[PDB]
Structure 1
Amino acid sequence: VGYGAAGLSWSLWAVLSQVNNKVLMWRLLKLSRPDLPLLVAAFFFLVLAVLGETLIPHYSGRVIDILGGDFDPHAFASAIFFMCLFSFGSSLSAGCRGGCFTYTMSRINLRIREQLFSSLLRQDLGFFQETKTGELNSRLSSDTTLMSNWLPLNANVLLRSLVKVVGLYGFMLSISPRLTLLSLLHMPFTIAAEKVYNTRHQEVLREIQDAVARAGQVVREAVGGLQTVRSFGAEEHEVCRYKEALEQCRQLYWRRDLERALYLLVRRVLHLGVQMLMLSCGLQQMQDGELTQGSLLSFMIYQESVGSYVQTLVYIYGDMLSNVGAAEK
């Protein structure tokens, strides 16, 4: 077992051992600085929504218990009223948060477009001799979209998970530090898989953007010189060229999607295996008498929740880094 542990740790560290992505993300943060008030408001509304959603379940359970057992109309009405009140507040806060995030994304996109265009206007003429207009327009209209395409969802998910993980870890430490230390088995595999997938994903995203630029250049040349293509009866030729470019783009898209699906399958299998391992260890401890049934169930709930939160954090952070770094040009 010692040999196996050493070998597995060595393999994981080989897989585990980025600066360009970090600097590009810092540049994106610098560009997003003017939207600080909107982000402050969004964070405030997110916190309020989480706080209200922590209160709704108590009254939902009260309603269920009243229905199942003795029905007291006054208690039923009070529980319904409080459930509705907290749901209303949480929904209001969630809507405000989503609107703020969406508007921040739109402002960042427009700022990116303006800065890229104003920078292009300053270049020397050799830069425009060595580049193509259709490809520049493809960058300005698609890579800018990629750079800000995830804030509303990814930011929300990341912030929720960050808010919750600390408390869940505290709870599961309160129940059983031994099983809490055991539960860290998943992190190495999670991080290694994320690293491999993120490398592949960023590469394929860059290739996709290049192919999109080539197809855009095909369209640019065909439409700009329409009277010359039509005076040689060469529209079908242009359509064939565009279809070839679109085929290349389609194959790149398929590679991206297939790799992402395989990664999701792999991480689902990892999750199932680690949960089985944790359940087996907890059952052994409970049989030995170390902890009771209720403690085991509570710890399993908390540890599975933190596992899900950590996997989501890792995946979303890697996804944001890939999307930002695919727009390197």
Structure 2
Amino acid sequence: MWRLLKLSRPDLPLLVAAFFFLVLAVLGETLIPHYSGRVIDILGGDFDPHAFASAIFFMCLFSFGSSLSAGCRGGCFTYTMSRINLRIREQLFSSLLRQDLGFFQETKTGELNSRLSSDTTLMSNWLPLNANVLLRSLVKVVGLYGSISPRLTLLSLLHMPFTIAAEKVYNTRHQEVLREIQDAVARAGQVVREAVGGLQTVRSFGAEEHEVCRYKEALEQCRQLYWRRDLERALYLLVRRVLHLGVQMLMLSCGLQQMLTQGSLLSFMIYQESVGSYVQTLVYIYGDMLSNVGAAEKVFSYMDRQPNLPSPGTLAPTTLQGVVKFQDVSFAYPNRPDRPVLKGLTFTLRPGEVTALVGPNGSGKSTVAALLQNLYQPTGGQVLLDEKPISQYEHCYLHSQVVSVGQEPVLFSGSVRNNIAYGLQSCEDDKVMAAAQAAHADDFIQEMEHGIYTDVGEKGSQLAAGQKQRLAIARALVRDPRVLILDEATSALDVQCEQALQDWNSRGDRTVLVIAHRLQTVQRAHQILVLQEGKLQ
């Protein structure tokens, strides 16, 4: 509604130039036919150096005046909507990064990229091909309404009710079919992302023909929606012209109330027949902009979606002891409620010792680690870090002190140094080489070209699984944390390396929480917690 007005608001200086270059543009082109008639009507008899040369000279200046101001209009319009489209895309992506972790479960990644790409172009390409038409049409109806008019304006009474109910039912149908077109495009885009991203699984089963056939079915559903939208628009335009003929004949049916003469009536018949089919452009174009703006409301709902995260933290101590306490925590995932995962856990963590959490698969060990990093909020009880709730600490402070290693790590595309120093605004190569030595990752780093600046593919596709795990450990260790969480860290590694990295508390001032699938994995931990079916024993 009014959001697009505030959105394009910092483009008004370039906008007010566009209506500046438009007023004198249409002014020039309306006066050109007058001087064109000045030249032609004197070809019966003309004087060589007289106003015939002046008529040509006067006509060419107004060609100069109209064409130059017309070029500056299009240049201003073409640039100003590159600015609008790139501003929309930035605000949408910035607001999409603040949402909670449960929001990304409901929506697919391919669908989100589709609205970020396709819908922003539609929401910016509405007026360009028509705003020149809109104000030119507004100018002409203003100029023409300045002849024989004893009751000419009578036609003004009949030109107000242009079957507004028929316009309203068409506007509802047009915004309906524009919504399904956007949804069908987003469904087809997800098919491309799923088949291309996971290619190695697709090629391993020889199922490339299945993914091609699925895309062909998705394209046909889009095509049937495209043809439906074009059909009703062409059907509506034909129906509108039939009514224009009807009202014109009905108005002229009362044309013999006095037969003011015949010649006076026929003089304005052409101009009346013009604006009869020329005011329909006004209601059509204005209706299009109203429907096209409201047909991309999925983007605007995303930009003003308030996440269910708590209030942002403000506490930031200069010295953290590192004590973590769980007090009767009860948790159930927000997208699938009414099914508890954790039930009444209660334990404490101390910086001097190493705590081991063991249990079977599907028990909730990684849910505990995810809740410990303030990724989710418990539905009962609370979790306390240094005698304070963990949600009161700053977002950029808490995650710099409490780091963790996931079950299967994901490495973003870029250099190895960028992945090791991920999340840090600045990190000298002294720190990176110090952390790479701790995780025993310097052995294979030297074998690659360019050293630590070599490329790593998407999701670490150009690395071994063992080498990917060592980069994740070095990435967490370079932050120098106070609380360290290890969630199945030493599984993909070989026997020799995982035995070398078993202490994790050489300094002795870090809280270490090791999470293992079996009890035999951990043997030196001071405190061992056995977690069965989501309830501590």
Within 2, Cα distance between the matches of 1:259 and 1:44?
37
Query: CA distance change for structure 1 residues 146 and 187 in 2, over 3 Å: closer, same or farther?
Result: same
Distance 2:283 2:144 in 1: 17
User: Who is 2:263 aligned against?
Assistant: 294
Query: After superposition, what is the alpha-carbon deviation per residue over 1:113-140, rounded to whole angstroms, capped at 9, x for unaligned?
Result: 1111111111111110110010011101
- Tell me the secondary structure at the aligned position of residue 47 of structure 2: coil
| 8 A contact 1:101–1:151 mirrored in 2 | no
- The whole-number CA distance in structure 1 between the counterparts of 2:17 and 2:72 is 8
Q: Secondary structure at the match of 1:188?
A: coil
Deviation track 1:247-300 (CA, whole Å, cap 9, x = no partner) reads: 1000000100100110111112122222333344345555xxxx2345424433
1:70-108 CA-to-partner distances (Å, cap 9, x unmatched) read 565533221111111101110111111121112122211
Contact 1:135 1:213 in 2 (8 A): yes
Contact 1:201/1:322, CA 8 A, preserved across alignment: yes
Name the structure where helix makes up a greater proportion of residues: 1
CA shift in 2, pair 1:147/1:76, >3 Å? same
Compared with structure 1, are the counterparts of its residues 191 and 94 closer, same or farther at alpha carbon in structure 2 (3 Å cutoff)?
farther
Kindly state the Cα deviation for residue 166 of structure 1 after the two structures are TM-superposed. 3.2
8 Å contact kept, 1:49–1:91: yes
Note the C-alpha offset of 1:192.
3.2
Greater mean deviation of Cα atoms: 316-325 or 151-160: 151-160
Q: 1:310 aligns with which of 256, 279, 289?
A: 279
| 1:243 correspondence with 2:243 | no
| Structure 2 CA distance for aligned equivalents of residues 245 and 300 of structure 1 | 52
TM-superposed CA distance for 1:190, in Å, is: 4.6
Distance change (3 Å), C-alpha of 1:77 and 1:321: same
Task: Please report the RMSD computed on the Cα atoms of aligned residues, expressed in angstroms.
Answer: 3.4
5+ unaligned residues in a row in structure 2: which ranges? 297-536
Instruction: State the alpha-carbon separation in 2 of the partners of residues 84 and 167 from structure 1.
Output: 23
Task: Pick closer, same or farther for the CA change 1:57–1:294 going to 2, 3 Å.
Answer: farther
Query: Aligned partners of 2:261, 2:74: CA distance in 1, in Å?
Result: 42
TM-score computed with the length of structure 2 as normaliser: 0.52
Aligned-partner Cα distance in 1 for 2:258–2:128: 43
Considering Cα pairs closer than 8 Å and 6+ residues apart, tell me whether 1 or 2 has the greater RCO: 1
Residue 260 of structure 1 corresponds to which residue in structure 2? Answer: 233
Give 5+ residue unaligned stretches, structure 1.
1-24
3-state DSSP class of the match of 2:98?
coil
Deviation digits for residues 193-227 of structure 1 (CA, Å, limit 9, x no counterpart) = 32222111110000000000000000010111011
Displacement after TM superposition at 1:66 (Å): 1.3
Point out the more displaced range, 89-98 or 147-156. 147-156
Q: How does 1:6-25 map to 2 (within 5 A)?
A: 25=1
Deviates more, 1:239-248 or 1:186-195: 186-195
Q: Corresponding residue for 1:101?
A: 77
Equivalent residue pairs, number: 297
Q: 1: distance between equivalents of 2:40 and 2:245?
A: 31
CA contact (8 A) 1:190 1:267 kept: no
Q: Relative to structure 1, is the Cα distance of residues 47 and 285 closer, same or farther in structure 2, using a 3 angstrom cutoff? A: farther
Moved more, 205-214 or 179-188: 179-188
**In 2: Cα distance, 1:157 partner to 1:285 partner:** 39
Separation in structure 2 between the aligned mates of residue 293 and residue 111 of structure 1, nearest angstrom: 60
Question: Would the alpha carbon gap of residues 231 and 211 (structure 1) be closer, same or farther in structure 2, given more than 3 Å must change?
Answer: same
Pairing partner for 2:59 from 83, 86, 89:
83
Q: Which has the larger radius of gyration?
A: 2
